[model samples]
Target: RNIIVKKLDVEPIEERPTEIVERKGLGHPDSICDGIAESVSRALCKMYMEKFGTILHHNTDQVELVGGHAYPKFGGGVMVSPIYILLSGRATMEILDKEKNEVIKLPVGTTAVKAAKEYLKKVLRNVDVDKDVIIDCRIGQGSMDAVDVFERQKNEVPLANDTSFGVGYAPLSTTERLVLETERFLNSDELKNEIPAVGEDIKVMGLREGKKITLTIAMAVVDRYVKNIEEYKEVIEKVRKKVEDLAKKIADGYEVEIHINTADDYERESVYLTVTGTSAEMGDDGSVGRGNRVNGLITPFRPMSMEAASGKNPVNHVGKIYNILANLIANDIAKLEGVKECYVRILSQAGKPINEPKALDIEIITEDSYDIKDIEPKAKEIANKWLDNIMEVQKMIVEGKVTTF
Candidate 1:
């Protein structure tokens, strides 16, 4: 076991002077890419399992979105050009079955394109996926090195295909939960059904200064639902109130204020209006690995992983598996007595088994005057239990119980 438990030498986030947290909603351009990438990976996994009874080599992580032009008016709007999306990466397009003595062709392009569009239709309520977005697949066959490592692990414990590291921490501070839940609340079907003008491209930024927390929200307004400037203003007011009420419930005991669409300029007749709920329909492009992480919030002060975990192989790619595992472990560890804050980081080497990381580090900040020395052994035990059942991470990820962005 390569697990090491240590004490952290900093104050808890609640005692910190300033904190920042952010989360992009499902309709944000970058979020759209993340959503599609993960959906495609899951779809490919099912295909492989159905055909060969196992998931083969694949990494559909690279995705890019090019913004298009649209004429958004007070009453209605039109897309001048369709939004273009390029799906990039590699998969096992053809596999040679040793016993069958034949090569089988996989429908990689068809699956990827269909998976991408279907994901868009599922998430973006107002967008006509088939007519408004041009989805293309450029995925090819995997490299010899990647496929070789994948093949070697097919009959046993999966091997790491990439030399990478994953970082996670828990539990969430007040500002982090406020930011994460605010986006989720606004983007829910209940809010959209109640306020049709609230678009899907919602972004929440929480800045906590001492006991006061200010949440700045950038949300799109669907043009067709708002007929005039007065109506748009009314829409903003309604959303503002809804969010304010939600915030009061979330960040209790803290003075909280809500600001929506600060970029709107009423004097210049400029506003955040769009034909579709997402900015991808106009001036905003998107890419995978450009948005929220696996935990769904971007924390600058905490340790973070740059690797995009959405489209990688759930069975082998440590970049994806280790991030999810680290979070799961940290969340569990945070529940232990005397643990105020827990951070988990997992490092891996290429071709290594997924269950055994090159290094697994756990840092804990104590609470209630309990010394770190008293909790060291229990913290290590918790981490060891998680690594022992690391396969649960793969099953949870594949079954949609976990998500990465």
Candidate 2:
């Protein structure tokens, strides 16, 4: 007689993917953050290519959706699965037709109001709104127009993307902090334990001649999760000590020209830390690398660098998703003669899909400050072009056609 083993079969549990929701804030109506918003929308479009490997129907606000899993976060967990993205903000566009000697204009008037009202009404129908998400379409509050002028001028020089060398410390880098903090969270038992117990606030910085610094500070909190201020302060001090130790190590061989600002003067209910240099030179201007997302996360609406995520994710991979939209916009605009970078933006109601994104707000710092008329038409043309093909460009990204940052 032969003994036979019986086997039981089981099916694998399928996991649903997360969606990314972008929420734009009420940025300066005339800042370059406006154009950056279009870049953000286009980048979102590219996400589908990685997931579906083919183009599915997509529009500005919602994509048919395809992409891989989010980056694994060690012990730290993501809140939502199949992360749905809700992009909120406002932006401006520009158009210039050198051959036709014409410029397009963005009529951001009462007409825009009607469109926005309709969009909000529609999106709110089936979604819960996050009130923090707000869009402001004040005239001349976004990206400028330079497309037609560039082409007409026959500017054939290929612009360089190597801005890394010129990027200074201070004004701080968002993605850099995110990467470092994430790394700390993954490696430190202290962070792992503190995150769930009391949220940790840490800061980091870099200086010339190889100097680097980091700091951790405690916050006073009044919440159900945080029971007492003493405990929070204790945890913060310990973390701060650890950061100071690390800073010393990094600064040991360098000139150590840097500053760490820890807030003891907080009247707030929560604690946080900011690491920066001593002088104004330590920080970059608001036009570049400003207003970081919480915990130093970088996005298109703000100044960003490929160095973000600290090389944890590939530059062309999920890392690109962080600021690809803004980079693309900047890259295209730079092609125009005399244009450095346009501040672009987009806005939306939280949880509501975006429709009828607004148009350009021009700001040009030239050899001679001139009238806005010189730039309005060109700005309109670019905006229209962005609206027309932004979706498709994102699809190209999804397909991995545009891989490099």
Candidate 3:
């Protein structure tokens, strides 16, 4: 296979004078949907493996979150409307057991709903799964052709189900890393333990201009933890200081400014408060692909694919495998001695072998005065090796070693 490695004339993100990056926290409505969809897919995979001794075809990609209504006060809040969540997808609803000559029916919808509710219960701190949210699972049977592509003999590579492409890049820029790690830090148990009042729905936006960077954050506060407007103001100020300090550590010497809840109006008693620690309780809807990418950050400057990797069959779904592979390849290439940055783009054809992509495109930006040609062969070798062992990606995904946002 001929893999193309070329030099990129553009400047790397770190070298750029300005950049913007954003990350949606785990409890954000969109992220919650992504998490639930992925969880449902994993649960279905386990059930299929247990019953048929192999994974079955399922694409639980269509998940929607319809916002609810809530009136959160200082002490507590009332959920006027329950968040409506619709789980619509396709799965293997039935399979024939040749040995028994009987068709075994699978509870695909029930399994998806169960997994989704379980995930919500586990992640949301104050949201009552039974009363605060309504879940409807409308998943039906998958297409025969799509399932047939995935139904391969033991030890054989599954065929690609979609003619999709995936893009990835290596070495996170300062702002990107800051944005990603800040969300992780806020959502971390360490932070949560100290600040129990902070809710889970946190969003971080990092904008860099020259040497100064500004972070605009929107954090949902649990109304039950707060006492009055004064305490709310104090808590937000404390949060701002802590985030500012944390940003200093992440960005080192960069001048970082932290702003929290810009939409809050103390005079009018309007704040970013939620009874369930998320905006979904107050009519903030979410969809699967509208959130973060696989890398956990959204960068308009960097190459990206709109493919929703979450909830897709990991075995041979190019949408999932290629994205993960591109990340791995780009990271591996960027680690080379002379490479400053690496970008990987992989293209696949439907019904083709997943291990063999139609095109393996690698673009490298080398260090000052360094020749990219010196590392071209190494890049190709790494890409090929990962493609040959693409099955490992599926294993990692099923075992919870990789994340698809």
Candidate 4:
């Protein structure tokens, strides 16, 4: 019940001399897994609501992607091995129909596989789902006690299923924002339309030294779009120029350097080209929680949790809800009048009410001439208000308004 706010003794971005951040694009193997897991969770939630009035208990968190083998060339390539994907989790597979006195069964595994395949089809341009990949679903039922806790009806708040915690922070540093937005820009509709050869598999790594910032990128190029090595070089140049231009726009006075596919050696005929527009088609395995944090960027300088938020039940799973709530709280606090930076950490106890966390810890680094004591009460007020409206997190997530990855 105690809410603590303390001064965070950390330098702001402008004052820091060194910073580093990274973002994995949607087509990356790990990112693909994240997207698929979240999609499966959403699909199962909709199905449960259609059959029963409320969403059933399910945790589709254990998804994996085993990379296949491929031989890529400048003009084109062939996939020798099909990507192996395993969708493993627990879900409510069946329910009772009281009116008809029959057992209504849900195809939990089937729904998950269908969702994953649909996601792959939509995101991948050259990868054929039927011919290039193998999808296996192994989702089973959840633990009896966990499901029982979820199914319990309570007037006030749902009890927590696991004793877990979530951590988040705000506002994002300049390097973090640049790293995140650079990937989004490369994968944007406008960029993709202009450069059809650019594949979906992209990774952006930003390193800042004083005012000089360098971005190293690895973008998978579609082999079908190029004729030879000359065409590939031209595409790479265009991508590099556009990214540099965009980075300048993101940060006004910072020196930005853009590098794409540094491992490409024309003499040796080695490049980052693929037949399916992703590395997953050629020996890049992935699993959930191994990629981005809930904030959409991986930050070693910032506090983060190993919890895989995707595919968890939205109603009372503190692992999912608390992480999202921590971000919201931290963002709100940083937007407060004089706050410069904010960090939020939440802890929960199994079987405890979701609305009442075991501990709500807030850390703030205020602007010069400002004291955190002046903002402590207001921060607590915001945290409590969000806790009162925590159910909105579930609604937004189910409605596709929030992204778990």
Candidate 5:
């Protein structure tokens, strides 16, 4: 019930001389784990809603992706070893059929593995879901399906499942936006359809020094579409041009420098190429929470929670729910007049209702024209209203409208 709206003590990130932002794109091993965990969680959520007419307690936040071996070079490549993916979580396995006076079994393992398969097939176009990856589900064992903790009337805000907190900030700087948009553009279907060599494992690192910004991009090129080193170089060049165009559009007023695959050494003909368009094909392991935050960016300068938003229960897992709400609150508050930047942090006590957080802290940096008091009340008002409508976030996520990664 406590809400704190205060003035930020530091300058806005854009005002600082040095700023750094990072984004781990779709096919990164770490991002892969996040995606699969979330996908499986939703699959289970969708099933539960249909069977029980409501979401039961479940958490699929634990996932691990261990890289395999690959020989990717000019002309083509082969996967020597299959990637290992293990999906782990808690799920409602069996529910009492009050109407039938019996119990119903939920195929938690089957649903999890299926969801993981669909996710990889959809995102990593170059990787064969059946041949390139082995998906295993280790979730909810027998006899723990029906817990009294899950007993609740429909439509009442569920109790917070964990005493965790979530943090988020808004008003991304020019460099942040540039890094984010560059990855999206390079990964866009339009670009991929034209340049089929571009791999899904993309990373964009943006460094802003004064008005000059440097973008270093690491892309895993798919070997099947290339013939020689010259073609690989061409693919790199094409990706560079497209990314440069994208960066300029986002930060048009700044001096931009683009670098693709800085680790490449043409002298030895060694470059960033992959069999399945990801480092995971070469022993790069991944896990949930090791990649991007809920806002889809790894911003060191902004306040962020280390809590992994993906795979957790959307109903009461404060780790996931608060992060989504904080970001929404921050973005909405930043749109208020004279607000330069907004940061939101929410904490919860286990067993408390999700809508009433233990504390909702909002920090703001006002524009020159307005003082802190000028908008503190409005900020609080906006945050309180979002807290009241907290149920919508869960619904949006269940309907697949919101993305935690």
Candidate 6:
């Protein structure tokens, strides 16, 4: 079956930003920094393909912005600096070797350098420019993980937890139910004595919808808890009743809910917490992506989420900045070509000020029969439009005109 997602403008009601935790150095939190770097990096990737007709696969991994900090100059003015971006992972570069191989792997720094060079050349476009805005890709310390690190870690197992965020449809407020059930079920007298006292570490991962809501709660406990579903069932039922009672009192119209999960799902460890909920609109397969840098902000653009400043920097997190711009650039390209879906990735480093960003990857997935060849031109046009004046786009993001999708 062929599906077409036509161009539609989704204007969000409120651009709710995520809660940001302040850090000591780097001046930005990891969440916002990573998000911003990834967004800009994708923009660069789209630009590269438009200008050079090649995609650098190595820059495809998560973009990490390493350094960019402003210091007081000898004079009164503040010195705006260029952030040093560390682009890791391997990218495909064509070589003139006798062997007709399609992919060639270079050292970590070299690929970043190649990526940076391509970015600057596009930035210069038809205008006269100096190469003083040094594009340095020779400093990346190591390559990023070829696969997602979360998959490698033995402890970071998937659990059942979910959340809901809406005004009308509920027996109980999802957030309130979570707080109560997690506290009563995981923190009550008998349960607390058996499990660790780890505060909000207890998570409600997934929500199963049937007659009653089935919430999946993950907790760190002895493996014995999973030896039989019966024992865990008893505990879960008690928790479910408590949740239902609470919900009944708060939201009488909505029905009660249930929960099912074992301590083994917690991997007998602590730290990570996960919550996955079904969106009545998104369905089971759809997941939220590129919302906010720090937290999930469903708004389409215009500083919609708290992620804009969630990172270390109080003034400019840049996470919201780049993701929003990248979306605009990519969407414009898709519109011109009448395409459906596009995935763009961006990456950057710290300490450098000038936004000579790097593109990680720009992928356009359209209706099965739509010729991608035509889409490339539109993509290139949009890429060049942003490259022509990088500063203006940055200003747009700062002013809250565009937003991250």
Q: CA lDDT of each candidate?
A: 0.89, 0.29, 0.88, 0.87, 0.87, 0.34
Candidate 6 regions with alpha-carbon error over 4 angstroms:
1-309, 312-321, 334-338, 347-360, 400-405
Ranking by TM-score: 1, 3, 4, 5, 2, 6
Best by lDDT: 1
TM-score of each: 0.97, 0.30, 0.97, 0.96, 0.96, 0.27
Task: Look at candidate 1 and give me any clashing residue pairs.
Answer: none
- Could you tell me the lDDT of residue 360 within candidate 4? 92
Q: Candidate 5: misplaced stretches above 4 Å?
A: 96-103, 141-147
Flag clash pairs in model 5: none
User: In model 3, which runs have C-alpha deviations exceeding 4 angstroms?
Assistant: 97-102
- Is candidate 2 or 6 superior in TM-score? 2
Writing each residue's lDDT as its tens digit, candidate 6 over 96-136 gives: 34687455433434434555445433322211113112233
Cα RMSD to the true fold for all candidates = 1.3, 22.1, 1.4, 1.6, 1.9, 21.4
Question: What is the lDDT for 325 in model 3?
Answer: 85
Error of 6 at 350 (Å): 7.8
Worst 10 residues of 5 by lDDT: 141-150
Which lDDT tens digits does candidate 1 get at residues 1-405?
Answer: 799899997889899999988898899999999998898899999999998899989999989999977889998898888999999887999978899899988998899998998888888888877678899899999999889999897677888897899998999998998898889988888989999999989999999999999999999999999999999999999988887898788788999988889989998879999998888877689999888999998889789999999899888999899899899889988998999999999999898888889999999998877988889988888788888888888889999998796
Q: Which pairs, if any, clash in model 3?
A: 67-283, 68-283
